Amino acid sequence: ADQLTEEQIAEFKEAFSLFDKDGDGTITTKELGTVMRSLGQNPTEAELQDMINEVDADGNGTIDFPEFLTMMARKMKDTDSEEEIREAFRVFDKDGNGYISAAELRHVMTNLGEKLTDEEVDEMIREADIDGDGQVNYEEFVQMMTAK
Amino acid sequence: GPGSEEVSAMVIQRAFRRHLLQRSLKHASFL
């Protein structure tokens, strides 16, 4: 999703409420860089300070629970990931072999979804068909599409 | 709505169009 949900908010409340040392429903701007990292993330000092500038615009030095949840809502996204792309190929590998054919990859791109262009299809074939030696080695092709 | 097969195809197509964007820069209006 592009936005947060009640089942995510219910877990983030338990972490935020330990840093609510005043009991008023707020944390400080210095506890922000603690609570986001104690939730298992690791943003930079610069990314943390830029998210503080988005909520400390009133100059009060404090952050309410819904203002902290705006940072988490902005962090949710529908974009691509290796764990999402890998499952699409695993659904099409009906034999469970860890490889598919060039005919299957051409068909599943030209028939299903929106119909992919032949110059995009023939490139998607080329880089997998060379590596898997006449088969499509999808398990490593997942990485070659999104490595950084 | 679309089928499980159709959204699985569109996930592979979107990842490949991102791979094409970083290779060929033809739609690099992002920056």
Across the strands, what pairs with A101? A135
Q: How many C-beta neighbours within 10 Å does residue A129 have? A: 18
* Domain boundary assignment for chain A: 1-77, 78-148
Q: How many C-beta neighbours within 10 Å does residue A85 have? A: 22
- Distant-in-sequence, close-in-space partners of A21: CB < 8 Å, separation ≥ 6: none
CA nearest to A124 within chain B: B16
How many angstroms separate the CA atoms of A137 and B23, rounded?
Answer: 20
Contacting residues of A for B15, CB less than 8 Å apart: 80, 85, 142, 145-146
Distances in Å between the Cα of A141 and the Cα atoms of A14, A32, A84, A116 are 40, 38, 13, 18
* Domain boundary assignment for chain B: 1-31
Classified as helix, coil or strand, A64 is strand
- Of the CA atoms within 13 Å of residue A107, those in its CB half-sphere come to 9
Tokens representing A85 are 């792309």
**Cβ-contact A74, A1 below 8 angstroms:** no
């929106």: which residue's tokens?
A114
**Cβ-contact A138, A131 below 8 angstroms:** no
How many angstroms separate the CA atoms of A88 and B11, rounded?
Answer: 7
- Say yes or no: B14 contacts chain A, CB-CB below 8 A: yes
Tokens representing A58 are 């009133």
Q: How was it solved?
A: NMR
Helix (H) or strand (E) holding B10: helix B4-24
Tokens representing A22 are 């005043």
Tokens representing A52 are 């503080």
Do you know the residue count of chain B?
Answer: 31
- Say yes or no: A124 contacts chain B, CB-CB below 8 A: yes
How many angstroms separate the CA atoms of A139 and A125, rounded?
Answer: 14
- Distant-in-sequence, close-in-space partners of A82: CB < 8 Å, separation ≥ 6: A142, A143, A146
Q: How many C-beta neighbours within 10 Å does residue A136 have? A: 24
Distance between alpha carbon A74 and the CA centroid of its chain, in Å? 12
Q: Is B7 left (phi over 0), alpha (psi -120 to 50) or beta?
A: alpha
Nearest to A106 by CA among A131, A129, A81: A129
DSSP string, A70-116: HHHHHH------HHHHHHHHHHH-TT-SS-EEHHHHHHHHHTSSS--
Q: What single-letter DSSP state applies at residue A129? A: H
